[PDB]
C-alpha cells in the first residue's frame, strides 16, 4: 500500500552539475518520501549531511545526527552515475541484480539550497524521497512551498512532508 | 514514521516482557537500528540497541537483556533481568540508517510493571 | 462534580488496592454515598457502595471486599480479596444523596492490575 | 474556597404560591449551585424530582434516579416555612442549632417550569443551589437563558450550570 515512485522524467536534473562546489554541510531543512509520515507528536530533530569529494570523484556521504547522550555519523558513498548530478551506493553490486539505488540532484545553486531525489528499488517494492537542504538551517519560505508542491506532483500527500525542526546540538560540529 | 507497541505490559514473575515494535515497511536493503529506551522519573536511559537487516534475528550487545526477532515492519522484543526498580516507560526507536536518507520513528513506549517475587 | 482518583494502582501479593477518592466538599449534614464499579473488557459491574457523613468510618456489606474512612472531601479506600481475574477498572461514583438537590460525580476510575502469587 | 451564598434579597419568591398546582413530576433541566461543575467527558444524566402534598400541607420529596442496572428512589419531606413557596428539612431539627435549610420557588407556572432555590447553611460553610424543573424533559430555550442570567445573578459562572441529559430509562415511571 506504500506510494510508486513516481517516473523519473517527472524528477528534473540540475543541469550542468558542478561537483566542486556541492562539497559540504548540507542542513536537512524538509524530507518527503513515500515512508515518511508527519506526526506533530513526534516532531522531527534537524540532521546535516556533509558531502566530501573523492579523488575519483565519488562523494562521502557523512550524516551527522544528535542521538541519546551523544552525536553520530553515518557514512555512505556517492558513486558518479552516467549523467553529472546523479550517484548510486558505492555497494550496490552486493544486494543482487534486482537492487537499485539512484540520487537525483534536482536543483541547486550550491550555496543556499539544493532538492535531492533518492530512490531504492527493490524485488517487490520501491521507496523514494525527497530533501531540500540549505546551507543553513533556514530557508526561504518560496522555497520550501516549491519544494511541498514538487513533493505533492510527485504523488505525495502533504501529510508525507517534514520539516525538521532546528537545533544547536551535534549539527553544527 | 508512526512505531505503534502496547500501551502496558506487566513484567512476568520471572522479570521478563515481551512485545512488539512496529513501522513503516523497511524493505531488504535498508539497514535498521532499533534503540529501547527507558524513561522513568523524568529521566532517560539507553536499554539496549540493535542493527539489523529485514527478517533476521537481533544482535544486541552482549550480556544485554534484550533479545529478539526482526519480520516484516517489525521487531518482536523480550527484555528479561527485569526488577522492581525497572518499572518504567519503554520507547521504541526505530532508525532507517541506510542507505541515505536518514529517517527515524519513536513510539509512545510501553509501560512496564515489574514486581518482584516473593522470597520463596 | 469532579472526582480525583490515581491513574494506576498495583496490588499487592496479597491482593489488596488502597487508594483515594476526592470530590467537593460535602459539608456535615450531606448524606454521601460512594459506589466503587468495576469496569473490565467494557463490562460495568458494582463492586460496594457506602453512605456516610463526612468524618466517619465507611460501613461497607457485610463480606464486603471494601473498608474505608471519610475525611474531609475525600473517601480512603481499602480493595482487598482481589485476584489476577479481577484486573481492571475501578471508578469511584460519589453522589449527594440527601437533602435536595440530588448531584453527583463520577471518576475517570482507578486501574488495578493483579498479579496471584507464586504457589510458595 | 466556595463561592458564598448569594443575600436572599437577590431570590425572588413566587407570589402566592400555589401548593395544589405544584404537586406531581418534575424533571430536572437545569441544575447550578457552588458545588455544581459542569464537565463534558462526564455528562450528568437527567433524573426527577415528584412532589406529593401531604395533609399537612408538607410535600413527600421523591427523586427518582436510574443508577446502575436499577431504578431507585431517594425521599425527603419538605415542610412549609413562614411564607408560601418556602419549606424546610422534615428533620432539620436533628442537625442543631448551627444548622438550617430553606427551599423557595423562585418562579413557576405550575404546568411548564419552575425554579427553586436550595441552601444548605452549617457551621462553617454554605451550600446553594438553583434548579429549573419541567413537567417535560425539554424547556424553551429562553427559560434556560434566563436560568443562567438568574444563576450568574447570584454569583455563579458559567461552568457551575450543568443541563442534564435527557433519558429514557427509570425517570419516566
Known sequence: ??????????????????????????????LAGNRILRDDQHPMNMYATIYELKEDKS???????????????????????????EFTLGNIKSYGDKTSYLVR??????????????????????????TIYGRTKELASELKENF????????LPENHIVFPVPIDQCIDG | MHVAQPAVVLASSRGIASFVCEYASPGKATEVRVTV??????????????????????????????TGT????????????????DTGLYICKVELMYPPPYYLGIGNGTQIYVIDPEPC
Chains 1, 4 share one sequence.
Open chain 1, 59 to 85: 562523494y562521502n556521504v557523512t550524516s551527522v545526527i544528535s542521538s541519546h547522550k551523544k552525536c553520530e555519523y553515518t557514512i555512505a558513498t556517492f558513486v558518479p552515475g552516467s549523467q553529472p548530478g
Open chain 2, 37 to 66: 529506551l527507558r524513561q522513568a522519573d523524568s529521566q532517560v536511559t539507553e536499554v539496549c540497541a540493535a542493527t539489523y537487516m529485514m527478517g533476521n534475528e537481533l544482535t544486541f550487545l552482549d550480556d544485554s537483556i534484550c
Open chain 1, 148 to 155: 511541498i508542491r514538487f513533493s505533492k506532483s510527485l504523488g
Open chain 1, 105 to 130: 540532484v534536482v536543483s541547486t545553486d550550491y550555496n543556499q539550497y539544493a532538492v535531492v531525489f533518492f530512490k531504492l528499488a527493490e524485488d517487490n517494492a520501491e521507496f523514494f524521497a525527497i
Open chain 2, 70 to 85: 526482526s519480520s516484516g515492519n517489525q521487531v518482536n522484543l523480550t527484555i528479561q533481568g527485569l526488577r522492581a526498580m
Open chain 1, 1 to 30: 500500500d506504500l506510494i510508486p515512485a513516481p517516473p523519473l522524467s517527472k524528477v528534473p536534473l540540475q543541469q550542468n552539475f558542478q561537483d566542486n562546489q556541492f562539497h559540504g554541510k548540507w542542513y536537512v531543512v524538509g
